[PDB]
Amino acid sequence: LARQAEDIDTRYHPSAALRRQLNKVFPTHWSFLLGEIALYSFVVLLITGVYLTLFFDPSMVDVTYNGVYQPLRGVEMSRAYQSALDISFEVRGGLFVRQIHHWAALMFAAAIMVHLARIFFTGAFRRPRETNWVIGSLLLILAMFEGYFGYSLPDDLLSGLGLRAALSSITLGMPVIGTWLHWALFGGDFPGTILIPRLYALHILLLPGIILALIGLHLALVWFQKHTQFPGPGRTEHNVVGVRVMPVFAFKSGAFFAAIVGVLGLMGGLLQINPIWNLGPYKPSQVSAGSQPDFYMMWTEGLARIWPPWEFYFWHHTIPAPVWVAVIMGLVFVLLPAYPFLEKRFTGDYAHHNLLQRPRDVPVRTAIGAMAIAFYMVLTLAAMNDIIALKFHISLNATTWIGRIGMVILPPFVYFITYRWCIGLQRSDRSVLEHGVETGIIKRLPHGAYIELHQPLGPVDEHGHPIPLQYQGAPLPKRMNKLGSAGSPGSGSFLFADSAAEDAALREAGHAAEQRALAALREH
Amino acid sequence: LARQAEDIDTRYHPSAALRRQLNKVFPTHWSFLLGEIALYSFVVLLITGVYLTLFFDPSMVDVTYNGVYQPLRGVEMSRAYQSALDISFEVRGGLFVRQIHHWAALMFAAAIMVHLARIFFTGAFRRPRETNWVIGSLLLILAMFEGYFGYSLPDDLLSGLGLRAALSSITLGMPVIGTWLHWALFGGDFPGTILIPRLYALHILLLPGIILALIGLHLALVWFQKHTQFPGPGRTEHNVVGVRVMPVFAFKSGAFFAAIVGVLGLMGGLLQINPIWNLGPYKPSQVSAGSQPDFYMMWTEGLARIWPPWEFYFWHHTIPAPVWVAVIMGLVFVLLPAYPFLEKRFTGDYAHHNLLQRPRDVPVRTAIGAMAIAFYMVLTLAAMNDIIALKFHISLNATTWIGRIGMVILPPFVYFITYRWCIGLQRSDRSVLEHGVETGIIKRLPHGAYIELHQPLGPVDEHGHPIPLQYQGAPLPKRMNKLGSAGSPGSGSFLFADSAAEDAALREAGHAAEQRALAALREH
Amino acid sequence: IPEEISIQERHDGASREIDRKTVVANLTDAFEGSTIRRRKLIGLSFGVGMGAFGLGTLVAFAGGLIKNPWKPVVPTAEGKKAVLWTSGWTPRYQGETIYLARATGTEDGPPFIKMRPEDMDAGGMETVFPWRESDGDGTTVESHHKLQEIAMGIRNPVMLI
Amino acid sequence: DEAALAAMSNQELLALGGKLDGVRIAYKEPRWPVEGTKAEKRAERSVAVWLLLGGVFGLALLLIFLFWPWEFKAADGESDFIYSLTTPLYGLTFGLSILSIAIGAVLYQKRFIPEEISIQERHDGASREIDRKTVVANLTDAFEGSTIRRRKLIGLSFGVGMGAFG
Numbered sequence A, B: 001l002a003r004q005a006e007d008i009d010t011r012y013h014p015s016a017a018l019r020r021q022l023n024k025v026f027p028t029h030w031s032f033l034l035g036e037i038a039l040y041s042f043v044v045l046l047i048t049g050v051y052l053t054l055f056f057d058p059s060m061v062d063v064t065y066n067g068v069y070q071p072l073r074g075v076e077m078s079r080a081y082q083s084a085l086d087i088s089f090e091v092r093g094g095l096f097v098r099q100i101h102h103w104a105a106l107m108f109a110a111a112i113m114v115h116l117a118r119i120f121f122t123g124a125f126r127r128p129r130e131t132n133w134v135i136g137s138l139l140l141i142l143a144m145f146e147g148y149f150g151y152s153l154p155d156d157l158l159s160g161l162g163l164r165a166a167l168s169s170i171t172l173g174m175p176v177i178g179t180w181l182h183w184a185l186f187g188g189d190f191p192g193t194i195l196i197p198r199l200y201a202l203h204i205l206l207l208p209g210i211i212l213a214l215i216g217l218h219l220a221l222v223w224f225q226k227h228t229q230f231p232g233p234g235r236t237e238h239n240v241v242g243v244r245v246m247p248v249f250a251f252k253s254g255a256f257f258a259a260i261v262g263v264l265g266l267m268g269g270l271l272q273i274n275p276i277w278n279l280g281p282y283k284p285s286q287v288s289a290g291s292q293p294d295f296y297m298m299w300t301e302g303l304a305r306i307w308p309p310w311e312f313y314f315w316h317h318t319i320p321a322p323v324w325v326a327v328i329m330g331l332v333f334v335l336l337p338a339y340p341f342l343e344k345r346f347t348g349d350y351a352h353h354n355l356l357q358r359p360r361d362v363p364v365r366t367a368i369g370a371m372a373i374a375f376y377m378v379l380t381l382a383a384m385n386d387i388i389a390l391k392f393h394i395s396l397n398a399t400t401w402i403g404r405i406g407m408v409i410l411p412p413f414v415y416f417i418t419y420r421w422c423i424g425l426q427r428s429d430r431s432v433l434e435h436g437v438e439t440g441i442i443k444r445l446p447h448g449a450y451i452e453l454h455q456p457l458g459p460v461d462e463h464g465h466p467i468p469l470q471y472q473g474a475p476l477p478k479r480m481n482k483l484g485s486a487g488s489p490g491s492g493s494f495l496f497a498d499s500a501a502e503d504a505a506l507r508e509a510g511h512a513a514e515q516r517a518l519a520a521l522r523e524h
Numbered sequence C: 001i002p003e004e005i006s007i008q009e010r011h012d013g014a015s016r017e018i019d020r021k022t023v024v025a026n027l028t029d030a031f032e033g034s035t036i037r038r039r040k041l042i043g044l045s046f047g048v049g050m051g052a053f054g055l056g057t058l059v060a061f062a063g064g065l066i067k068n069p070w071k072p073v074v075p076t077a078e079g080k081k082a083v084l085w086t087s088g089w090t091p092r093y094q095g096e097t098i099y100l101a102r103a104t105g106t107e108d109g110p111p112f113i114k115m116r117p118e119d120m121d122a123g124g125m126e127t128v129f130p131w132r133e134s135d136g137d138g139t140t141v142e143s144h145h146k147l148q149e150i151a152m153g154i155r156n157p158v159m160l161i
Numbered sequence D: 001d002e003a004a005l006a007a008m009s010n011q012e013l014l015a016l017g018g019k020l021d022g023v024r025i026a027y028k029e030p031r032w033p034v035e036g037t038k039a040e041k042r043a044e045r046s047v048a049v050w051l052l053l054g055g056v057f058g059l060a061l062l063l064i065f066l067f068w069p070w071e072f073k074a075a076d077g078e079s080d081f082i083y084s085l086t087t088p089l090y091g092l093t094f095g096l097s098i099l100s101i102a103i104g105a106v107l108y109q110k111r112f113i114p115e116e117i118s119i120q121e122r123h124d125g126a127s128r129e130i131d132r133k134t135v136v137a138n139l140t141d142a143f144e145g146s147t148i149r150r151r152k153l154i155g156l157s158f159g160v161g162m163g164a165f166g
């Protein structure tokens, strides 16, 4: 479209920033898409939530149902619960959309956690990027609380119990402020008339706006501080080796977006999540057995379950037990964003870093991370006590005490094992550097001796033994077939062979192109 | 803060984009702040609306008031009206905040209209900036509809009448689609149960988001296509003469922001707007006498009032009168964004332009704009028929016919007068270019002749008459005192004089600096 | 799509000294030229003024939400108490009868009915609510409101063993 | 330049930055060339009293918001007239405080910050041919290299598929 392109060029003349953005190089490691997963989940959340806002009515006034769902006719409920039932049963395709919304929220949280694990273990938070780590931590906290406020909207029995217990009766117990916070937030005592509209406003407008601003800032910082990379053949602290945006990277990103949307649609159509009609409207007099929040608050619930009943009563006052949960959760939320500064104070290393570390080269940090993950898993499993004790025949008090003791003895055990495992991996790497790659072939050496036919990775000395290499922070091959050793199948389709000339030509050109890629990337 | 600044510099190294943005030059004309006014009004709207969302409940269920406002106790009303009454009477400082909100909406609309008038009359929409004109037009439409949806939220008698008439019964009358649109929007017949929540979602989330995106794009386009300027001493089509951002422009912008916030606070505290309690809750059986919308929809109302009753009845069908209002409204909204292309097709001028035009140098466009403004004023005054006929003792039918005839005879009269006025101004400029500036002094010239002692603006010939100058698109002085002719008062404070040395020194240095500024800007 | 490899030339670290020196000179000259450093009174008055405006504004912004949890609003037999100490089981006029009503789950006339001690065996449990016969059954709108407020009170339910 | 960029004074650095950006500041002038006079002290005192007023009435806003009778009291027996003045006082204190601050700032800019004129070097129009040719070559090569032009079936099936999904 020559005329339109030229007229855009005389009116705006970008032609240089477009060239500067079309030539940007991005590294290609499978581990660098765990943030794209979260970004795409957030986009799907935005779209489905904008759809949902056209049918939801966030009031707490009481009505009688008089709808299509018969086992609930004549029951008195709030207006939000009725609006959610109307979305579920009286809009063509509404149940599908809210199920997609909930599944996308779950995938958002899970992808954020996996991305954080990557960032922590590879060491991508060092000198140039502590602030980007901090922004990520804030994003994590906001996502947690946004999901909570979200699933507490269509007030039914389970959401009501969660709200009541956690919000009302942990805010009510804080030492001095306490009830003042409770009355500022609820407008009075727990079941009010302004809670659900306030949560609705917080959930559709404020927290999404803050999250959008922080995500923009995060991606800008990642764009202008170029990406990190793993050590390898042609990689230095001064260059980025990968593919340009122009043909390839946008294509791969868009295809990944479409595949994630496909997975979310499939599992939002085939699996059922939050069937609010099986529950009832919230009433302060009735309860059920499950309880349980979504899996990103289960650690908070489990911590409240397995913490012993230690209270303090002094003059004319009372400090209850959930205060402990409050300070422990605050301590966790404060220890997360302040980790890079702690590590740089303790190790005393303040240099710029653009090459990542393999998790096996840093045993102490890997052990710390494994200990934290074990602690989190214990806290999460201590939240499904009832389900575990019912399905697997175990006592309930037994599960409580198992959690209460594991909380102390599992983290150090995991630390010890992880440290020893990291050093074992290092030794296994050094052995294949010193000798060659084991091929698995045995010989008998006419004077009855068995050898195993190693294969060298570099030069050899006078008597056939390879000269040992030096470690360079890059992974080493361990299987002979990963190196081209046994390959080149036929060149048919699946049941009929091709000609021999075609097979030879294709094999030979493929070999040539492989060798040229190798020789080109070495030499730079 | 040397340590912090340097560590920011080794982590981000901007140091060049910051220098590129601290040296940007902005022209300084009083007419270039009419967009800042609208921007600041929008910011205040955002803040006050975020405050308001914490107390509003958008339901249409019926309740009995039982509040503090006594003349309404026992009356049955919706939940939105009760929430608005509770904001007004039971939150410390809520009435003040909603009055600020409404006044800021009004100032937003007025500032947008004045800014559009400037952009149109100075010719700042030519070749490089048609798309920026288009974005501005879209912003105007969105602001209109957002304000409408906003003041229709606390459903009282006036807002209900406005909704009913305009929305329901103009959407109901469209030729073929019609009732289908009505039922898709209201969920059924007019008074539904999903209207107010849907308007709430549209008003706090969607339209503000679209407006924010469009404002960002608008300001980006203005930032990267540098500002226009008026012709003058050292101004060319290739440079920008003004002040740098660094010390001055940010300071002036912030001071203007604070002054606008001050004006809005004052007039939101001292003047009363929309007293919903004097009205009642909306009921389809009762009505009042003044049923006008805010001043940016008054033209729509007036057009509906003064359009004659022309309907068409053919086989089994009916085309009512408000269809006419619909097509005229759409025609206006389509003719606004497509004006630059019309003018470039009609005049045949396709060149780049960075210097503005004085409205007196383009008589035809100025006459067109004056005609459009006269049409708008007629339509707006035809909307307050009742108030005009009541306060000023005129018949009501008389006002209807006055509007109906003015709608045809006022625009052309205004066109004619504006054309002649522009050419008169041009001639007045040419006269002071040919001769000098009239001083107003009379002499008697001993043979009884009266002359008037002109004052030349340039060189003079042999016999004292000035040689005529050439017009350069810049304004010319007309009063002798605007040129330094009679100045230099005393240098006291107000009642006590200073020393003579101080007075002489200050006067003399001031004169020197003025002369140096002049001589410097000429020579470049 | 063809296979490719590229290299990007990071150019990280501190800026070139040219840009650092020029931008710091620009900032320092913009600051020293205003002469604000040797104007103490203007600066300090400006500070106090902005601080007072900001404080007053923030207090007015966050002042409509704050409520006192201990103001007496609930009428009882010894005056008026705070909400957090009344229960609905609290007597109102010094000797009123409050029955232990039970829920029936139906809305013809009774959502709450009185109880007798013989309506329970030695291994039973039942939830009960305060009745206050002046509330009546759920026929009119007034009694319906009273009953729907009895049913939703976070300190009302009681187990009868 | 050089390493000897140091030992250079402030004004040469500022003009160097300006010329690097294309800005050429002409006619920079202080406001008070003579030393301490009474006019300078008077202007400083006038600029200061406005900010003092702004702060004083911000404090007044705080006090009024805290200690003023605000509840609805309207009737015809006890004519309140104190409740009818509760919102006007909020507005009168808030707006006037921030207006005084703004006026003080404008006066400070008008009477103490030096007067200047600058010129910016627009550089408008089409791009240099270098960038146009290079970017169009990049786009054309990225398109022709994928060979999609001579693959009709893939393109048309892709189009129909995306259209149906959308």
Ligand SMILES: CC(C)=CCC/C(C)=C\CC/C(C)=C/CC/C(C)=C/CC/C(C)=C/CC/C(C)=C\CC/C(C)=C\CC/C(C)=C\CC/C(C)=C\CC1=C(C)C(=O)c2ccccc2C1=O
Binding pocket: A026, A032, A036, A043, A046, A047, A050, A215, A216, A219, A220, A222, A223, A253, B138, B141, B142, B145, B202, B206, B207
């Ligand atoms: C037009 C009008 C005036 C006519 C009048 C009509 C009428 C009368 C008036 C209005 C009436 C009403 C009914 C109108 C209805 C309007 C209604 C409310 C429409 C709502 C609009 C719409 C449906 C909302 C939903 C859609 C929307 C929410 C989705 C947009 C997606 C969002 C905004 C983007 C967020 C993400 C963004 C910040 C990042 C973008 C991606 C970035 C730039 C690239 C990603 C990326 C980056 C940046 C890396 O650095 C990177 C580094 C290493 C590896 C990978 C990456 C990587 O993938």
Ligand code: HEM
Binding pocket: A042, A045, A046, A048, A049, A050, A052, A053, A056, A084, A087, A098, A099, A101, A102, A105, A108, A143, A146, A147, A150, A151, A152, A153, A154, A203, A204, A208, A211, A274, B205
């Ligand atoms: C950004 C992160 C978000 C998260 C983690 C999240 C999470 C949730 C969850 C888990 C629910 C419960 C849905 C159900 O159980 O049926 C929900 C409800 C809802 N969400 Fe979101 N959401 C997000 C963003 C949004 C956005 C951006 C919007 C609107 C623009 C939105 C609109 C809604 C609405 C209206 C509901 C209530 C409707 C219903 O419950 O059926 N959400 N949210």
Ligand code: HEM
Binding pocket: A205, B045, B046, B049, B050, B052, B053, B056, B084, B087, B098, B099, B101, B102, B105, B108, B143, B146, B147, B150, B151, B152, B153, B154, B203, B204, B205, B208, B211, B274
């Ligand atoms: C952007 C342009 C906007 C305009 C022109 C506008 C206009 C209006 C107007 C005139 C009212 C009537 C207020 C009254 O009479 O008391 C109103 C009400 C309201 N506005 Fe806005 N508004 C805008 C943005 C917003 C935003 C961004 C929000 C929230 C984030 C918001 C929230 C509200 C609420 C909740 C109400 C109803 C509360 C009440 O009526 O007291 N508005 N709007």
Ligand SMILES: CCc1nc2ccc(Cl)cn2c1C(=O)NCc1ccc(N2CCC(c3ccc(OC(F)(F)F)cc3)CC2)cc1
Binding pocket: A148, A158, A159, A161, A162, A163, A165, A166, A167, A170, A171, A174, A181, A291, A292, A293, A297, A300, A301, A304, A326
């Ligand atoms: C015990 C938890 C639990 N049991 C069950 C049982 C059944 C079901 Cl279905 C769900 N649950 C949950 C549950 O939902 N857990 C998620 C959760 C936990 C805590 C918080 N928090 C609110 C704010 C508080 C707060 C706020 C402000 C403060 O002021 C300060 F100091 F300034 F910050 C201090 C504390 C802290 C805890 C939210 C969600």
Ligand SMILES: CCc1nc2ccc(Cl)cn2c1C(=O)NCc1ccc(N2CCC(c3ccc(OC(F)(F)F)cc3)CC2)cc1
Binding pocket: B148, B158, B159, B161, B162, B163, B165, B166, B167, B170, B171, B174, B181, B291, B292, B293, B297, B300, B301, B304, B326, B329
């Ligand atoms: C007559 C107006 C009026 N009389 C009174 C009397 C008393 C009071 Cl208090 C207020 N008023 C008002 C009033 O408030 N006027 C503002 C107004 C006018 C028209 C519209 N309509 C919205 C959408 C419709 C529409 C929808 C879809 C369309 O799509 C299609 F069909 F394809 F074209 C086209 C048009 C048209 C405009 C909104 C607000």
